[PDB]
Design an enzyme around this catalytic site. Sequence first.
Site, PDB file in Angstrom:
ATOM      1  N   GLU A  32      -5.997 -17.156 -24.270  1.00  0.00           N
ATOM      2  CA  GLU A  32      -5.621 -18.355 -23.522  1.00  0.00           C
ATOM      3  C   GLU A  32      -4.142 -18.222 -23.220  1.00  0.00           C
ATOM      4  OE1 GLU A  32      -6.838 -21.409 -26.861  1.00  0.00           O
ATOM      5  OE2 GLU A  32      -8.109 -21.939 -25.178  1.00  0.00           O
ATOM      6  N   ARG A 259     -12.677 -12.297 -38.087  1.00  0.00           N
ATOM      7  CA  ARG A 259     -11.340 -12.555 -37.603  1.00  0.00           C
ATOM      8  C   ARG A 259     -10.476 -12.144 -38.738  1.00  0.00           C
ATOM      9  NH1 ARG A 259      -9.179 -17.290 -35.619  1.00  0.00           N
ATOM     10  NH2 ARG A 259     -11.112 -17.505 -34.460  1.00  0.00           N
ATOM     11  N   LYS A 269      -2.104 -21.720 -34.524  1.00  0.00           N
ATOM     12  CA  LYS A 269      -1.114 -22.106 -33.509  1.00  0.00           C
ATOM     13  C   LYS A 269      -0.381 -23.353 -33.975  1.00  0.00           C
ATOM     14  CE  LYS A 269      -2.160 -22.451 -28.848  1.00  0.00           C
ATOM     15  NZ  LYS A 269      -2.663 -23.390 -27.781  1.00  0.00           N
TER      16      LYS A 269
HETATM   17  N1  LIG Z   1      -6.912 -13.679 -36.478  1.00  0.00           N
HETATM   18  C1  LIG Z   1      -7.725 -13.141 -35.534  1.00  0.00           C
HETATM   19  N2  LIG Z   1      -8.477 -12.023 -35.768  1.00  0.00           N
HETATM   20  C2  LIG Z   1      -9.289 -11.514 -34.839  1.00  0.00           C
HETATM   21  N3  LIG Z   1      -9.379 -12.088 -33.620  1.00  0.00           N
HETATM   22  C3  LIG Z   1      -8.690 -13.185 -33.257  1.00  0.00           C
HETATM   23  C4  LIG Z   1      -7.800 -13.787 -34.224  1.00  0.00           C
HETATM   24  N4  LIG Z   1      -7.245 -14.861 -33.638  1.00  0.00           N
HETATM   25  C5  LIG Z   1      -7.729 -14.925 -32.368  1.00  0.00           C
HETATM   26  N5  LIG Z   1      -8.592 -13.907 -32.133  1.00  0.00           N
HETATM   27  C6  LIG Z   1      -9.401 -13.672 -30.913  1.00  0.00           C
HETATM   28  O1  LIG Z   1      -8.739 -13.173 -29.742  1.00  0.00           O
HETATM   29  C7  LIG Z   1      -9.275 -13.783 -28.561  1.00  0.00           C
HETATM   30  C8  LIG Z   1      -8.208 -14.602 -27.832  1.00  0.00           C
HETATM   31  O2  LIG Z   1      -7.402 -15.390 -28.724  1.00  0.00           O
HETATM   32  P1  LIG Z   1      -6.806 -16.844 -28.326  1.00  0.00           P
HETATM   33  O3  LIG Z   1      -6.110 -17.447 -29.537  1.00  0.00           O
HETATM   34  O4  LIG Z   1      -6.321 -17.031 -26.925  1.00  0.00           O
HETATM   35  O5  LIG Z   1      -8.190 -17.617 -28.163  1.00  0.00           O
HETATM   36  P2  LIG Z   1      -8.578 -18.974 -28.953  1.00  0.00           P
HETATM   37  O6  LIG Z   1      -9.425 -19.804 -27.974  1.00  0.00           O
HETATM   38  O7  LIG Z   1      -7.392 -19.526 -29.755  1.00  0.00           O
HETATM   39  O8  LIG Z   1      -9.561 -18.307 -30.044  1.00  0.00           O
HETATM   40  P3  LIG Z   1      -9.706 -18.963 -31.510  1.00  0.00           P
HETATM   41  O9  LIG Z   1      -9.851 -20.425 -31.080  1.00  0.00           O
HETATM   42  O10 LIG Z   1     -10.895 -18.291 -32.139  1.00  0.00           O
HETATM   43  O11 LIG Z   1      -8.429 -18.620 -32.221  1.00  0.00           O
HETATM   44  C9  LIG Z   1     -10.381 -14.669 -29.048  1.00  0.00           C
HETATM   45  O12 LIG Z   1     -11.572 -13.883 -28.994  1.00  0.00           O
HETATM   46  C10 LIG Z   1      -9.955 -15.015 -30.478  1.00  0.00           C
HETATM   47  O13 LIG Z   1     -10.983 -15.535 -31.362  1.00  0.00           O
HETATM   48 CS   LIG Z   2     -12.076 -21.200 -27.749  1.00  0.00          CS
HETATM   49 MG   LIG Z   3      -5.065 -19.345 -30.161  1.00  0.00          MG
HETATM   50 MG   LIG Z   4      -8.361 -22.531 -29.892  1.00  0.00          MG
END
Ligand SMILES: Nc1ncnc2c1ncn2[C@@H]1O[C@H](COP(=O)(O)OP(=O)(O)OP(=O)(O)O)[C@@H](O)[C@H]1O
Ligand SMILES: [Cs+]
Ligand SMILES: [Mg+2]
Ligand SMILES: [Mg+2]
Length: 543
Positions: A32, A259, A269
Site C-alpha cells: 500500500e 509473516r 504501522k
Molecule cells: N512482517 C511481514 N512478513 C511478511 N510479509 C509481510 C509482513 N508485513 C507485511 N507483509 C506483506 O507484504 C505485502 C504488502 O505489505 P503492506 O503493509 O502494504 O500491506 P498491508 O495491507 O499492511 O498488509 P498487512 O495488513 O498484512 O500488513 C502484503 O502481502 C503484506 O501482508
Molecule cells: Cs490488507
Molecule cells: Mg502495512
Molecule cells: Mg493493513
Amino acid sequence: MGLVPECFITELVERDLKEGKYAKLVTRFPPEPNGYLHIGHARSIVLNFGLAQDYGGECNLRFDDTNPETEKEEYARAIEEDVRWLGFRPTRVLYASDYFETMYQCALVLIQEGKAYVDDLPEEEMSELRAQGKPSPYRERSVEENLELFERMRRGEFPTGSRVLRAKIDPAHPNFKLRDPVLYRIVHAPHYHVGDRWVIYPMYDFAHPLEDFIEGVTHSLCTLEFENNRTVYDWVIENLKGKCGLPTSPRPHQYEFARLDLSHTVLSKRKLIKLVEGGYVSGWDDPRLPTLRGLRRRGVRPEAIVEFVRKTGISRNEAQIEMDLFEEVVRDDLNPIAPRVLGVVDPLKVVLTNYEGEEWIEAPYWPRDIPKEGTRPLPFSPELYIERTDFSLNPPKGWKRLAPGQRVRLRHAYVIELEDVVEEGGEVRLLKARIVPGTLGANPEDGVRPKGVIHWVSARHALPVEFRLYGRLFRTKDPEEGGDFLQNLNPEALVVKRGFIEPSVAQDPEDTRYQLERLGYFWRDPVDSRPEALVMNRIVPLK
Ligand SMILES: Nc1ncnc2c1ncn2[C@@H]1O[C@H](COP(=O)(O)OP(=O)(O)OP(=O)(O)O)[C@@H](O)[C@H]1O
Ligand SMILES: [Cs+]
Ligand SMILES: [Mg+2]
Ligand SMILES: [Mg+2]
Ligand SMILES: [Cl-]
Ligand SMILES: [Cl-]
Ligand SMILES: [Cs+]
C-alpha cells in the site's frame, strides 16, 4: 542456485509449471503506498520477485492503492526505491487505481446478474444483522433500482460512508466474511494517482483478486491474515471470469506463507508511527528502526537482508525469529568485505616517556582467514588514545589488557607497560607508559608475553569521529504484544560517543564498511557524515 529455498511453494509452482497448468509463473508484490517498507516486507519481496527469477517468470510491483485518504506518491517512490535497493527488478510497475474503470464495469455486471446490491443501512445496524445472520431489508432490491443507486453513488450524491454495495452471497453463511461482504464504499476524497475522478472506491476483498486477474498473476502470495478471506477471493474470480475483458482461463490462486515476526522489534504501522511522531526515534530512516530505509542508513547491506530472509525460510511456521539470528547474518555478510582499521570510542590518553618522533607502520586490513591482501600506513607516535575500558587500576582474574603490572600489545605495533597514572577528580585522565624496547613485530626479551592485544590510535594523527552506537530498539523479546510497549524501549538504543579513527579512512570511498577491531562494524552515516566532520554508525557489534 535457487534464490528461494525449497518449500511447499517452490514445489507447488514447480508442479504446476511442469504440468502446463500455467505457461509462465507470474507473482506480484503488492504493498500500500501509505507507509515505508520494513524487514517483514522483505520476506514478501524476496519471495515474490525471487520466484519470478528462479523460474524464468515475471513479477509485478503493484501498489494496491484503493484507500485514497492515506496514500501518497512519495510512498510509492520509496517503495520502488527499497525494492530495487534489495536488488530486485520488477517486470512492471503498476497501480491498482489504473484498474478502477474495469473494476467499476465489473460491479455493473455483478449487479446486472443480481449478484450485488446497494445497502442504505447504517454501519452499526449492518454489523448487528451480520452478527445475527439476518439479511438487509435492502438486499432483495431489483437490478433496476440498484443500478440507479450505484449511479447516484458514482455521482457523489451521497456523503462519505453512507451507502455501500455488497455482494449477495448468504447472509447466514457459516463463514462470517461471506455474509454479503462489502464491494464498494463512498469516500469524497481525491486519489494521489488518479485524482478527483472517483468518489466510489472498491474494498480490498473485491479489487485485489481483480488486479491479480487483470495482470494474469498465476500464484497470488499472501501472508496468513487472509485465511477466511480466501473464500471471497474465489467468489470474485469465479463470478467474473470471462467478463469485462477478463480471461475465462487460466486464473490466479492464493497461497499463504508465515509473516515475519522478529524479536526485539515492532513492525506494526501504528506502533511505528508512534515512535516517529513521539520523537522516540529521529525519523523514518533512523538506524534504530527496522524500516528498509533505516537498515540501509544503518549500514546493513541489502545482501544481508536477502540472505537473512533466504536463510530463515518460507513456511506456515510463524515461530518468532530471534534478533541474535539477524545480527549474526549481518556480521557474516560483512566479514569478508569490511577492511579492518582501528578507531577509539571512549578515548583515554597515553603518553610514552621512552619514545619520540613518529614512525609509520605497514598494517594489514585483512586477518589471516580472509584471502584478500591489502595494507595501509598506520601512524605511531608518543601520544595515543586507547579505550578507557582497556585500563584497570584493579584488574580482575582474566584481565587481558592494560593494568599497573601488566604489559599489553598495541595491535600492529609495540608492547607497552604502565609507568604512572595521573588522576584528577577521582577518575583517570592520562596514562604515562613505556614501550618494551624490541617488541615491534616480536616478543619481549624476558619471555613474559603480553596477556592480550588492545587497539589504539595516534593522538598526533587521528581523526575526530562522532560514533553513533546502535543497539536493539527494545529490551523485551516480545514488545509487539507485551503490554507497555514504550516502557520496553532499550535506553541504550543509541549512545553517541565522540571518538577517534586512524587517518587512512580519509582516502577511502565514502561507502566503505569497516571493521573497527574489537568494536564492531562501521560506515559513514550517509546523511550527516562530512569529510571534515566524520560521523560513523555502528552497523552491528561483534559476537
Ligand atoms: N512482517 C511481514 N512478513 C511478511 N510479509 C509481510 C509482513 N508485513 C507485511 N507483509 C506483506 O507484504 C505485502 C504488502 O505489505 P503492506 O503493509 O502494504 O500491506 P498491508 O495491507 O499492511 O498488509 P498487512 O495488513 O498484512 O500488513 C502484503 O502481502 C503484506 O501482508
Ligand atoms: Cs490488507
Ligand atoms: Mg502495512
Ligand atoms: Mg493493513
Ligand atoms: Cl602501506
Ligand atoms: Cl598485534
Ligand atoms: Cs590475509
